[PDB]
């Protein structure tokens, strides 16, 4: 409903067609902005997910 | 009219249900009928195969009588007052073996307490004449069984009950205690009702999960089967017991609703607790000390028994041609007969023939040792229709044991013919 650009544009379509709406995985813009602002004061924030099954670490953008 | 199992029987008084209905007992899709055997529960509607379970009866906690299995003794409907003399009698019982005695005492108190469902319901329970429990059996009946070991156990049990009455119902007892069991036959009726009608389940009342022994009204009218239509479930929130139809089973009108009392047990136990015996007890044992062994896998194949050893069932789709010979007893047979199964090497046909005869020999010996033949027994049973109920039971135990030995002979022979196509 607020601030996820890709996701927002899809829901209007699912509804007109009659489909189901998936749960979003990417971050909202609000979060992306914070990272950019911090990277402006020379600090870095990263989000990683560690897979339970194989132990791999993946960096979400 | 349509032929249904229920048709033969007659409907019970309206009052069986009413007494319960005023309290919150509800029954759905069910009736209740009476017959010579006693009350039984039948169906009144058709249910198609179903996705999840359906409730047939809901019985509230207050109607029931219950005691916990472990040592701090907690009675959930809580009829007994603090300081009453009955607790001392209940407390002085071995925690592990006697729960029957504790339950008996509670039932007797209930009959003396006002406004307790049991005062009203007990009128519907079996009398001394109509109960099959062997605690109430004479020397003669015990003799007719023809088994030394069952007979002995029963006498030890009869004595245990008398001893309790003498020890606790002595002369100096306060009258509140005395009134409950003035004569010794009353204690015995109570132990008989407890053993025959008790159910063990795990119950959660509030946040306490405990395991208990309980006497529950209206659910005792179900009968045993080893291929059961229904089961028992505790619904915690409304504090009720639910009797429920198993998922996936078609039930047609006029059918009998059944539950399974104990699982995995032989006919000797059913007689000690319930005075009932079954021609087909899938788990019964006939003992052969004879050396010979037939091969296992083939046995299963000829008679289409499929499954793991623990669970054997007849696949009926494989048996396109309508067969009937295979029943509980052939399954029982599989487990009992000594068998050899090695690797994958196929059995030698002549080699096994030796085994079949040697095994049958043992069966003939067994049948002979008994005083009378199977046909003779039916005659005694048919001769007197009205007789002490315990006596008909004893004769029927005999007929049943013999009949299973006979079935095995018939079956081992059929193996022979089919080994060689």
């Amino acid at each position: 409903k607020s601030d996820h650009i890709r996701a927002r544009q899809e829901v209007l379509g699912t509804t007109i067609i009659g489909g189901t709406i998936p749960n979003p995985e990417d971050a909202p813009e609000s979060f992306r902005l914070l990272v950019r602002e911090l990277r402006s004061l020379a600090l870095e924030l990263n989000h990683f997910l560690v897979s339970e099954k194989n132990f791999q670490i993946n960096r979400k953008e | 009219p349509h032929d249904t199992p229920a048709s033969q029987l007659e409907l019970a008084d309206p009052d069986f249900y009413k007494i319960g209905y005023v309290r919150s007992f509800r029954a759905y899709g069910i009736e209740f009928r009476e017959g010579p055997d006693g009350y039984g529960v039948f169906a009144s509607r058709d249910v198609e195969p179903l996705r999840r379970a359906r409730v047939i009866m809901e019985i509230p906690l207050e109607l029931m009588l219950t005691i916990s299995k472990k040592l701090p003794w907690m009675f959930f409907p809580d009829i007994i007052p603090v300081g009453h003399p009955i607790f001392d009698i209940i407390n002085s019982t071995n925690p592990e073996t006697d729960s029957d005695l504790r339950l008996a005492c509670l039932l007797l108190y209930a009959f003396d307490c006002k406004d307790n469902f049991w005062q009203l319901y007990g009128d519907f329970l079996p009398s001394d004449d109509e109960c099959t429990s062997f605690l109430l059996a004479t020397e003669e009946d015990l003799l007719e069984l023809q088994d030394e070991k069952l007979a002995s156990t029963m006498r030890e049990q009869q004595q245990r009950a008398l001893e309790f009455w003498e020890k606790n119902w002595h002369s100096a007892v306060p009258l509140k205690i005395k009134r409950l069991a003035r004569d010794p036959e009353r204690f015995i009726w109570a132990m008989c009702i407890a053993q025959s009608r008790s159910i063990n389940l795990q119950m959660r009342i509030g946040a306490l999960v405990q395991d208990a022994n309980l006497l529950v009204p209206y659910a005792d009218m179900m009968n045993h089967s080893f291929q059961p239509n229904c089961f028992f479930h505790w619904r915690f929130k409304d504090r009720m017991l639910e009797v429920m139809i198993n998922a996936g089973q078609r039930i047609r009108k006029g059918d009998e609703m059944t539950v399974d009392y104990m699982a995995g047990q032989k006919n000797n136990f059913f007689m000690q607790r319930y005075g009932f015996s079954s021609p087909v007890n899938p788990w019964d044992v006939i003992h052969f000390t004879g050396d010979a062994k037939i091969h296992l896998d083939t046995f299963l194949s000829v008679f289409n028994i499929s499954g793991l050893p623990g669970e054997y069932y007849h696949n009926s789709r494989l048996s396109n041609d309508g067969d009937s010979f295979v029943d509980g007893a052939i399954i029982a047979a599989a487990r009992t007969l000594p068998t050899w199964s090695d690797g994958d090497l196929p059995p030698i046909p002549s080699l096994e023939r030796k085994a079949v005869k040697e095994l049958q020999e043992e069966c003939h010996q067994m049948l002979a040792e008994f005083p009378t033949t199977s046909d003779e027994d039916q005659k005694i049973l048919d001769s007197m229709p009205d007789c002490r109920r315990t006596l008909e039971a004893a004769i029927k135990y005999r007929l049943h044991r013999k009949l299973l030995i006979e079935k095995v002979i018939q079956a081992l022979d059929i193996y022979q013919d089919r080994i060689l196509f």
Partner: protein
């Protein structure tokens, strides 16, 4: 092939030995194929499925064994306690956490619940 052509529906034991042999030899797909036929001719396949999986482990082809079990599980076929245990232990000794947790989760859904044995094995790969 001949018997099949004759038209007789084969006896159960025969199919079984085939599975045992095929299993030794890692012929997983082929073994799986036999099972499908057993089903078409109205037979209970639970007993056989266990045999294929068991042997494959003794014959050192674990990867396929895991794959056979999982396919079976989806169908709804239940499993013996001993089999579940073998697969969880063996996988952890080689090092495969992924397969092991999937199997543990399935034991649970079917009904058996974990004990300290199962956890200890899992922890070995985790530490």
């Amino acid at each position: 092939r001949r018997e099949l052509s004759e038209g007789l529906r084969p006896l159960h034991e025969t199919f079984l030995a085939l599975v045992r042999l095929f299993g030794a030899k890692g012929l997983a797909t082929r073994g799986l194929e036999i099972l499908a036929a057993m089903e078409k001719l109205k037979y209970d396949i639970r007993q056989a499925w266990l045999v294929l999986v068991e042997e494959l482990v003794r014959s050192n082809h674990l990867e396929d064994a895991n794959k056979v079990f999982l396919k079976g599980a989806e169908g709804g076929l239940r499993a013996t306690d001993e089999i579940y245990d073998l697969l969880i232990e063996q996988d952890c000794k080689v090092g495969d956490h992924s397969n092991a947790l999937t199997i543990a989760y399935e034991m649970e859904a079917a009904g058996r619940m974990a004990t300290t044995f199962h956890f200890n094995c899992l922890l070995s790969v985790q530490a």
